[model samples]
Target: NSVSISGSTSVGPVMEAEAEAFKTKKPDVSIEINQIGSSAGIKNAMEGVSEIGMASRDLKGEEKQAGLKEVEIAYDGIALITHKNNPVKDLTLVQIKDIYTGKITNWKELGGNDAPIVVVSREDGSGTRDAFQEIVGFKAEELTVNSQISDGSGNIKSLVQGNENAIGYISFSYVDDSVSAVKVDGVEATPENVLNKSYKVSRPFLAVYKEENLTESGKSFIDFILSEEGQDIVAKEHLIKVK
Candidate 1:
């Protein structure tokens, strides 16, 4: 049998790792993965388009009522990032909200530079954007009109890395020397901080699917993902294992 999984580019790494090991153990079963956005992922599962859907955020009320079920496979933090050379390393949640909403338009206003702030954001229907908006307290329409919306975390990181005045958010796993993760409300973005609940902007990594459509092999894969070996892979991918 073959399994198809899709969604959430941010959740791809962990699933990819687990699938690699899973294939070794079950050579007769094949797996396919696509890194589409979360909304597409959930829709695929809901429509029986894929065997499993990966999401970086929790399901909305309506989605849960649509006969979809989600397993909390792991946890991840969202990190607000800026150019590594940007002098502003910290920002309060209020300031971040204002910056995103166009209320604060310049780095100078935040004690960084005299240049205009380049607000970067994920595209509409992104799970990262949904979770971030909820935690940071704003709706998608409230974002600055001039904001640059990227399709994935890699693109968002690239935008911030190339512009000293740019600010964006991405899954913490994407944090590296290419960009600097700003301190949110004086709390550093780290796995420990997220684990301890000090890093407030975090969400569960979910494996979603229509319960009835899930095949026997699909169930085995999900079970293996929750196994200790699978959790070890999750942790290796820089996500906190649910197990």
Candidate 2:
């Protein structure tokens, strides 16, 4: 049997690895994974175009009303990142919001270099962007209409890494030495902090399916993802487990 799963790019690599391992055990089964943004994944699942959809944020209200059943597959943390040369070490949630919303336009305002704060953000439909907005209560505020760039988390990381005054957010699993992650309200976004719920930006990585259309393969795949071995893979990939 063949199955299609699509969702957050943040979790795409890990799911692909798991799918490959699963294929080794069940050679006859086929799985295709796509890295659309999480919101697109949920929308596609609701439309019955895919067997499984991945989301790094919770489904609520209208999404639930669309009959999308969410399976908690993993836990992830969103990190506020700056370029390697950025001197600022930390930021409070309010200060972070101010920067994104254009209220704080210069890095010097946050103790960094005297340069314009280039706020990079994902498109409106991206789950990672949504999750960050929710964390800082920026759902209603219009994002600054500047030279904002929109793409996958990887692109966001790359943009911030290249620009000293650039600031953006991405899944903690994607953080590398090229950029520095800032502590939110003095609490670092680490796996331990995420597991203990001390990291306010941590969220459940989910698989969404249409309850009525779930195939045998979809059911089995989700079961495996929630199994101990699957959870171990998630942890091994530096993601936190939902449980």
Candidate 3:
């Protein structure tokens, strides 16, 4: 049997790992995963091309239309990151809004060095981009004209890591030694804080499908990941687990 899944770059790794571990129990079953962003995943599920679709943001608009069976299987946060040397430690929602809008251009404007602040962002249609924008109070027109967009969360993390003046947002799971995470409104982006509602940039990690179309293996695979053992793997991978 084959269990095919795709979508949400943010959810890709954890799902892929569980797939391999699950093989111990069902060695003959094969699992395939695609790391395309959330939109493509949901579309494939709707089209019957994939048995499971992974999405990291809330289903909105036409996505909530007919035939979609959604489950909140995990939780994740979008972390604001900067170079290790950047002096700015925390930003209020208003300050983040100003930065993304190009209203705050230089590091000194936010009380850092005199260098120009380099803005980095995810490309259009990314779930991380959608969650970050909505959390920072943007209704539309996400990145400023001055911002450089990255193709993936890893790409943005690299850009922010290599540039002293660069500031970007990445999946919380990717926040590590390579990049420095800063607080939003004095709230650190940690799992506990996100779970407690002290942090404001968190979003759901979803497993989407047309339920009636799922393979038996696919259904068991989904249930396995939602089980305590699978969620522990998810937590180990650095995401906020579903309670």
Candidate 4:
């Protein structure tokens, strides 16, 4: 049987990995993953185009109406990233909101160099962008006009790494030594912090689908996502398992 899962680029990397491993055990099953955004996935699932819709944010309202299920597979932190050499050590959530709102434009405003701040962010409808906004208490439309927006986490990291004054947010799994992750409200951005709920910018990795619509192959594959082996793979990819 073939299982089709769509949505959530934030969850795509790990879902692809689990699908690969699951295929080793069920060679007859094929798993197809489509990296549509979360909103697209929801529509796909509801319209019967996808067996599972992957989402990184919480399901709001009627998506949960009529027995639609949101299965959590993992958790991830959205790290506020800066250039590796940026002297700024930490920022409170209040400060971050100010920066992204264009209220704070200079690095010196945050006690750094006199350079102008270049804000970078994810494009609209992305799970990362939505969750980051919720975490920082901003409306979707409130993002400052001074920001540079990108479509993917890799590009966000790439864009920020090249500029000294740039600051951006990315999936914690993608945070590497090349970029620095600063503290939010004096709390560090780390897997441990996330596990402890101290990292305020975290969200769930979810699979949205109708239980009645699942085929045997689809059910098995979804089961693997919550399996110990699968959770281990999630942890290996720098995501928190849904414990």
Candidate 5:
């Protein structure tokens, strides 16, 4: 049997890890995943193009009204990352808003070196960006025109890693030693913090499917994803398990 899943670039890594482990138990089954943005992923599931769709944000009102079902697989924080050498380790939520809106344009303003703050942001329709924007209380039009638009979490992380002045946000799963996730409002962006609601910028990792269109294989796969071992895999990926 085969299963197809498509969606959010932010959720792609977690899905890949889960698929890898599932493969070990069901070697005969094949799983295919597509790393399109969350909007497209939702459309694909509604149109029956894929058996399952992965989303890194909560469904919009329209989506919920469209009769699609969403399974909360895990919770992931939207971590603001910077170069490892950047001395600015913490910022209030208001500071983040000001920085992204161009009011605070230098690292020295936040106690770092005297240099321009390079703002890196994800593209439109991205689950990560949508969740971050909503929680950070900014619209796309409010973003600074000087912001560098990145396409994927990997690209955003890479941009931050390569530029000492760059500040970008990415999924918590993608935050590693290569980049530093600054403390938001004095709270660290860890899985435990996310689960306990201390991390302010976080969203649910959702598995979306059409109830009427779901295949047996797809249902089995989702069941496995919510199983105890599946939640364990979610934890292993540095996301907060829903269960």
Candidate 6:
């Protein structure tokens, strides 16, 4: 039978690679994955739309109310990204919150260029965006209404990479040469930092399912994620291993 999994955009590349590798070991099994954000993934799992839901951030109160069980698979750091040309290197949490909330609208306010601060964010239901906001201590109502928003982390990264004044958040795995990652409170957002809980924005990638419908394949997949080979893949994919 085919296995259906859906979840956050941040984990999509890693899961795609894992699925391909899993198929090599179990050639008879088929898998389908969707890159809907984590919140939607939880909703789909709760509604029985998929057997396994991939979430890059922890479930919220509403998901708990719907009776979802999360199996920890991996860890990822929510990285603050700026254009390659941006000079600002580090920011305190308070500064980050102020930037995103529109209270600080110029890079000069944070010791950067005199240009206006361009804040790019994820769409409303995106798990990464939600997690970022939570870590920064802001609710949905606090986000700047004019902030640029995208549906996928890749899009957000690209937008920031092209705009010198733009700032955005994405998973550590998505950090590429085009965009530079900024340190937060003197702590670098790295896999090692995430594993040790040194990164303030670090969070886990979870495999969510209904407690009653935990299938054998799902159990095996989760076990594989915790296994040695799976951990190797985590390193290869630029994600953090949950010890």
Per residue, candidate 3 scores C-alpha lDDT tens digits across 1-243 of 988898988888888888988898678889999888888888888898888989889987888885698888888978899999888998888998999998889988888889988999887768888888888987557557889888877789889989999999887888888778999899998988888888888899999899788888988888888888888888987888887
Cα lDDT of model 2 by residue, 4-114, tens digit? 998898889889878977887667778899998998999889998888999989885778888677788888999999998888989998998888788899988888788
Q: TM-score for every candidate vs. truth?
A: 0.97, 0.95, 0.96, 0.95, 0.97, 0.96
Give per-candidate clash totals: 0, 0, 0, 0, 0, 0
Q: Which digits, one per residue and each the tens of the lDDT, describe model 4 over residues 1-243? A: 888888887888898899989989789999999887777787788878998888888876766664667788899999999999899989999999999988999999899999999999887768888888888988867778889987777788998889988999988888889999999889988888999988889999988888788889888887887989989989988999887
Better of 1 and 6 by lDDT: 1
lDDT of each: 0.90, 0.85, 0.86, 0.87, 0.90, 0.87
lDDT of 6 at 25: 71
Write model 5 residue lDDT over 1-243, tens digit each, in one string: 888899999889878888888888777778899998898899899899987888999998878877888899888989999999999999999999999999999998998999999999998879999888899999899999999999888899989989999999999889889999999999988988887888889999899998888877777778888999988988988889884
Candidate 1's residue-wise lDDT over 1-243, tens digit each? Answer: 999999998998788888899999788878899998888899899999988999999998778877788899999999999999999999998999999999999899999889999999998778999999999999987999989989887889899999988999999888888899999889999888999998999999999998798988898899999999989898887788783
Cand. 3 TM to true fold: 0.96
**Model 6: lowest-lDDT 10 consecutive positions:** 213-222
RMSD of each: 1.1, 1.3, 1.2, 1.4, 1.0, 1.2
Candidate 5 collision pairs: none
Q: Report the error of model 6 at residue 159, Å.
A: 0.6
Q: Show the lowest summed lDDT stretch of 10 residues, model 4.
A: 59-68
